[PDB]
Amino acid sequence: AIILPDLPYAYDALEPYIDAETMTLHHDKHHATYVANANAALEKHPEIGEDLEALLADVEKIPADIRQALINNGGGHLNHALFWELLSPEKQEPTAEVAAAINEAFGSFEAFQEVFTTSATTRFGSGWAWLVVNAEGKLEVVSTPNQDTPISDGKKPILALDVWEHAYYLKYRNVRPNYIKAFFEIINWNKVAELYAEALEH
Amino acid sequence: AIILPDLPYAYDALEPYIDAETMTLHHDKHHATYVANANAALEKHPEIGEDLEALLADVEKIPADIRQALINNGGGHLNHALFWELLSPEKQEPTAEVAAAINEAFGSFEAFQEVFTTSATTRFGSGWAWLVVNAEGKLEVVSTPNQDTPISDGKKPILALDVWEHAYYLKYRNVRPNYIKAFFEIINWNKVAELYAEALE
Ligand SMILES: [Fe+3]
Ligand SMILES: [Fe+3]
């Protein structure tokens, strides 16, 4: 069964940039729901196993009677599990490997930050902004709706920002640009590096 | 230009069911932004006029360059303008013909409320739950994503509930069902009636 992972840090470890109340609800209610619902789907189809990264890579291969349920809830699990690991109680900067990759794709960190900020800001309705490795090993910024993940498009996420209103409304209310700015103070660049390196390996 | 309508009641008129801070943000920030973005789009195309209901009923006739922006922001304005009118600061009950139509269509009001509540809770992500009069003059519950409106599908709304998290999160947090229950205390049934009568015309 899919298990709800604990946060890597205290509920208040990302203050003042994300409030503890939001960390609490976000993890203990939202993410827990996704996990429950993902487990309900998977239990109908024990034959498919519980490797959600692999299952979500080709959604058409998921059995039709649980396909949207698994996309939405298995995707909600994957995305939030990743999100928590990508947040750091301590300030960081991109490691050399990642900074070089960013410059290769976007020219400069400032350009990347503009592009990713824009992606996060213009996502209409619920969704996520991502930095991903494509099948050629090169970086892209993309956003997705609801709990859709770029894994389903053959991409490997290295950075993820939740832009559902639940992720920011208690502190930031309508002002999602302030939330997006705040995120850049709490990125776990070392975790981005790990995911980047893993994406190149095979 | 599209004008932001004032609320029909004070910001705190729906308390304790909807908090004032939400009403204020929702109207003054969210709906205002939809209006501003809708005007920015229409200003590129003055020759199309500003009849958003007509424009959104057949979106394939809004120019392509502003089509999505007008769906999202034109639709955000129409949906929110309707929603403020559908809320009542004192307790109302269904009018007779609307009650009867609901019992014919749904069995009982309690079943209708269940159906509507299911639609509202299962709308995944952002969107709206609706009671509409379809092309046959028949009642249907449906949900839509984002700011999509059933008028784009030839359906006439008589009840609408915003289930974007901005509409409920400050008070209800994750518990969208408690917000939906609260809505049922604050429906303007008189408005529902007007809308229903117009749909059947
Ligand atoms: Fe979330
Ligand atoms: Fe709204």
Q: Which of A41, A21, A17 is nearest to A29 (CA)?
A: A21
Tell me whether B173 touches chain A (CB under 8 Å).
yes
Phi, psi of A23 (to 5 degrees): -55, -40
Cα B111 to its chain centre, rounded Å, is: 21
Spatial separation of the C-alpha atoms in residues A139 and B191, rounded to whole Å:
52
Tell how far the Cα of B34 is from the centroid of ligand 2, in angstroms: 10
Q: Is A6 annotated as a binding residue?
A: no
Does any CB of chain B come closer than 8 Å to the CB of residue A168?
Answer: no
CA distance A23 to A171: 11
Torsion of the alpha carbons at B15, B18, B24 and B29, rounded to the nearest 10: -170
Q: Do residue A174 and residue B146 have CB atoms under 8 angstroms apart?
A: no
> If you count residue pairs, one on A and one on B, with CB atoms under 8 Å apart, how many are there?
49
B167 Cα–ligand 2 center, Å = 5
* Six token digits for residue B168: 């409920």
Tell me whether residues A169 and B164 touch, CB distance under 8 A. no
- A151, A50, A161, B146: CA torsion to nearest 10: 80
Question: Is B24's Cβ below 8 Å from some Cβ in A?
Answer: no
Residues with Cβ < 8 Å from A190, sequence gap 6 or more?
A88, A92, A95
Which ligand is located closest to the Cα atom of residue B27? 2
What number does CATH give the domain B19-89? Answer: 1.10.287.990
- Among chain A residues, CA nearest to B71: A124
For chain A, how big is the Rg over CA atoms in Å?
17
Query: What is the SS3 assignment for A186?
Result: coil
Out of B146, B166, B170, closest to residue A124 by CB: B146
How many CA atoms lie within 13 Å of B168's alpha carbon, on the beta-carbon side?
23
Instruction: Indicate the CATH number for domain A19-88.
Output: 1.10.287.990
Give the A window 107-166 contacts with B, CB below 8 Å: 124-127, 145-147, 164-166
Residue B117 and residue B132 in contact, taking contact as beta carbons nearer than 8 Å: no
For residue B32, the chain A residue with the least C-alpha distance is A174
Per-domain residue ranges for chain B? Answer: 19-89, 90-201
B25, B72, B124: residue with CB nearest A174:
B25
Q: Does the beta carbon of A72 lie under 8 angstroms from any beta carbon of chain B?
A: yes
- At A14 the three-state DSSP class reads coil
Q: How remote is the CA of residue A166 from the centroid of ligand 1, in Å?
A: 6
Method: X-ray
- Neighbouring-strand partners of residue A193: none
Burial of A179 (0-12, 13-18, 19+ CB in 10 A): buried
Q: What is the CATH number of domain A89-202?
A: 3.55.40.20
The whole-angstrom distance between residue A183's C-alpha and the CA centroid of its chain comes to 12
Handedness of CA B93, B98, B101, B105 (dihedral sign): negative
A128 bridge partner residues: A144, A162
Q: Which CATH superfamily is domain B90-201 in?
A: Iron/manganese superoxide dismutase, C-terminal domain (3.55.40.20)
CA of A164 to the centre of ligand 1 (A): 6
* Resolution (Å units): 1.6
The beta-carbon neighbor of B146 closest among A25, A125, A173 is A125
Smallest CA-to-CA distance from A101 within A201, A202, A193 is with A193
| Residue B68: alpha-carbon gap to chain centroid | 19
Q: With contact defined as beta carbons under 8 Å apart, do B112 and B192 qualify?
A: no
Half-sphere exposure of A5 (CA within 13 A, CB side): 13
SS3 assignment, position A52: helix
Q: Residue A34 — φ and ψ, nearest 5°?
A: -55, -45
A69 touches chain B (CB under 8 A): no
Closest C-alpha to B180, from B106, B93, B118: B118
Q: Is B166 annotated as a binding residue?
A: yes
The 3-state secondary structure of chain B reads CCCCCCCCCCCCCCCCCCCHHHHHHHHHHHHHHHHHHHHHHHHCCHHHCCCHHHHHHCHHHCCCCCHHHHHHHHHHHHHHHHHHHCECCCCCCCCHHHHHHHHHHHCCHHHHHHHHHHHHHHCCCCEEEEEEECCCCCEEEEEEECCCCHHHHCCEEEEEEECCHHHCHHHHCCCHHHHHHHHCCCECHHHHHHHHHHHHC
Tell me the nearest-neighbour CA distance from A7 into chain B, angstroms: 19
Question: For residue A197, how many other CB atoms are within 10 A of its CB?
Answer: 14
CB contact under 8 A, B173 and A29: yes
Separation of alpha carbons B140 and B158, rounded Å: 10
